[PDB]
């Protein structure tokens, strides 16, 4: 391979797919992880009818397209639509030929082997890449936060994971999973805003409520004190202008929504909160490395962009962990992209160029080569 060829880096998020080239400081493209198909025939006469649509183009046509996600809870669920996301990534967003660039992919931890093999087969037989690789999203987040030892709380859209890592070794015996992230939080926000009298049920309204979630919600340091203040004072309420010009006032829902991360009981889930997920994950590791994990607890992914979440997690893990452990949350400003930035760093290193699956090795070995290369 010519040393001047920059590899493509693609982040397979459940909410938004991200894309760019190795060595960039940030992804060049980000778009919803959706493929759309017409709700009825004959609607789009004269507007260039297609069998399906992808990304922003499909998102703006939500009113006439049924929309489906090929990536759900961090796992791929529809491979034709996954190929269409990758097609949109290569040809429509990045505008390059994938057979001319190596491609690095991201995945959820503990991703089933069949999915990895199918990704490998699609990349080498459909897109004919000269090389490709796969890596865990949380691990790339730790790399982007400049670290090789630490535990990452990686929260995208449809799922959260807590991933302890020792000198780059991800540790499956201590990884924990939590089927709860911004998607579930948006549903809960729809619920409590409907209880507030601002009824939101349609597929379009759900995105307005996601915008409210992104702009106005925050993690409070003390849930009880915050509730008391909201009930005794209206200073916590914020105005939001709906697309039709109607202004609605959002109150305690700002923090009741993300609180489900720490107390999943609000959702009816008998599950650990993100603080407990991280704490128990650390406590499943060997005692000697728990101190380093406590000192290097990293938050990553789009769901972690709230205010105050770092402080709340720090408080919770200081209260849970032994007094001897020097707890420290790390929450970078670009942590929504750290998943992808780690791949940029990884794929641009000269010593990493030995780690690829090559087209030759795939032809010699088949998809199972992924179990010998990618982790």
């Amino acid at each position: 391979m010519d040393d001047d060829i920059a590899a493509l880096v693609v982040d397979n998020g459940s909410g938004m797919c991200k894309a760019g080239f190795a060595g960039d400081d940030a992804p060049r493209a980000v778009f919803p992880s959706i493929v759309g198909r017409p709700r009825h025939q004959g609607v789009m006469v004269g507007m260039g009818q297609k069998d399906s649509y992808v990304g922003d183009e499909a998102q703006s046509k939500r009113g006439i397209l049924t929309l489906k996600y090929p990536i759900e809870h961090g796992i791929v669920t529809n491979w034709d639509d996954m190929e269409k996301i990758w097609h949109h990534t290569f040809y429509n967003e990045l505008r390059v030929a994938p057979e001319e660039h190596p491609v690095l992919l991201t995945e959820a931890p503990l991703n089933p082997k069949a999915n990895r093999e199918k990704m490998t087969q699609i990349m080498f037989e459909t897109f004919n890449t000269p090389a490709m690789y796969v890596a865990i999203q949380a691990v790339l987040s730790l790399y982007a936060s400049g670290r090789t030892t630490g535990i990452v709380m990686d929260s995208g859209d449809g799922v959260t994971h807590t991933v302890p890592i020792y000198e780059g070794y991800a540790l499956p015996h201590a990884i924990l999973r939590l089927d709860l992230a911004g998607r579930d939080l948006t549903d809960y926000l729809m619920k409590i805003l409907t209880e507030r009298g601002y009824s939101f049920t349609t597929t379009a309204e759900r995105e307005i409520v996601r915008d409210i979630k992104e702009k106005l919600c925050y993690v409070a340091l003390d849930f009880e004190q915050e509730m008391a203040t909201a009930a005794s004072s209206s200073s916590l309420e914020k105005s939001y202008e709906l697309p039709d010009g109607q202004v609605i006032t959002i109150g305690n829902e700002r923090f009741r929504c993300p609180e489900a991360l720490f107390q999943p009981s609000f959702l009816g889930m008998e599950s650990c909160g993100i603080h407990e997920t991280t704490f128990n994950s650390i406590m499943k590791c060997d005692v000697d490395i728990r101190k380093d994990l406590y000192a290097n607890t990293v938050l990553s992914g789009g769901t972690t962009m709230y205010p105050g979440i770092a402080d709340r997690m720090q408080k919770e893990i200081t209260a849970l962990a032994p007094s001897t452990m020097k707890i420290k949350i790390i929450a970078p400003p670009e942590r929504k992209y750290s998943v992808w930035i780690g791949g940029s760093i990884l794929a641009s290193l000269s010593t990493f160029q030995q780690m690829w699956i090559s087209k030759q090795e795939y032809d010699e070995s088949g998809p199972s080569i992924v179990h010998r290369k990618c982790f």
Partner: protein, 59 residues
């Protein structure tokens, strides 16, 4: 595999720490420059003030 992915990322961040070391070195050299100029000006003005007084003694 994980060790290679750890060592190359560690080399990357070691380069980053080297760059931060260069930034800190730049600020320390700025500090050296201003400190040196300040007390050089002081001691020259002092020994040249001590020489004008000595010249006052010389009649």
């Amino acid at each position: 595999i994980a060790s290679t992915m750890a060592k190359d990322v560690r080399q990357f961040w070691s380069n980053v720490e080297k760059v931060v070391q260069f930034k800190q070195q730049s600020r320390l050299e700025e500090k050296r420059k201003k400190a040196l100029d300040l007390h050089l000006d002081f001691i020259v003005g002092q020994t040249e003030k001590y020489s004008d007084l000595l010249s006052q003694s010389l009649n």
